[PDB]
Symmetry: C3
Subunit: 114 residues, 3 copies
């Protein structure tokens, strides 16, 4: 089973696949802890109710998007290490439609190289 997690803004809550062992753990405030070194794909959709969103790793800004219409794919593909904290933040949540705003992550491959 793949390792996938999805955070819904309407519920403010994480759901994840039942894959064992977990590759991620849900945290409060919409954060996620990476448990395994790996290559991960982050996806997501942000619908407006222009707004701006920021994807972050620990302190680092992975990306900043600004749009006056729905962003149907935020994120990208990143190597993360065990302990990395991933977060998606909004300039103002009053500008987004929570019912149709969510983000998520899937493990593509562990990093057992040469």
């Amino acid at each position: 089973k793949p390792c996938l997690a999805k955070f819904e803004l309407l519920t403010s809550k994480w759901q994840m696949t039942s894959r064992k062992p977990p590759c991620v753990n849900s945290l409060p405030e919409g954060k996620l802890k990476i448990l395994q070194d790996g290559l991960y794909l982050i996806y997501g959709q942000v619908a407006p109710s222009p707004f701006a969103v920021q994807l972050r790793k620990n302190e680092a800004m992975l990306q900043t998007l600004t749009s006056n219409s729905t962003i149907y794919d935020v994120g990208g593909t990143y190597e993360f290490h065990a302990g990395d904290i991933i977060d998606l933040i909004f300039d103002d949540e009053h500008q987004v439609l929570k019912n149709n705003t969510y983000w998520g992550i899937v493990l593509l491959a562990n990093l057992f190289i040469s």
Copy 2:
């Protein structure tokens, strides 16, 4: 076997992996029907013969790209639900080189979460 489908503009035709059960079904007019809830990656290449292309889900515009050179990767990563209809349309097909224009989709993960 992964679930993958690819549409070629030269043949106007879909080809797909032999994976059972199917996760997608080919439709006329270059459309595709999603059969399973899931996280999908859409890819593709559009070569010019500036042109514009639009990726759509049902009524929704997923993305619009405009370029005067080859776009080597259209698309992105999206959650789709069973019944969603995906389409890639061109502002004018006379502006593209069909022999080197194609698009496609692969299932990354079904959505069996928490």
Copy 3:
């Protein structure tokens, strides 16, 4: 085991998963040879010490990125054929921080279609 390869700029060296048979082979000058037809995802990070980077397939420019801050995800998703040579080049390596600059590739699916 997935087929994954990663090139580090600090070592100027490729590392790869032990997956058999290989889907790629490392080459000198930071190049990579595709051994199997397939859909591949290219990722990478380029940190500055504005700089520009170019991802190439054989002669073809897949993409050109320019930034004055870290690019946390270069690349995208592409069909490659056996024999394709992939390369990532810099306008000037004196503008990048090699310790935190790397790029890589993972095989998503072989191309056994209809």
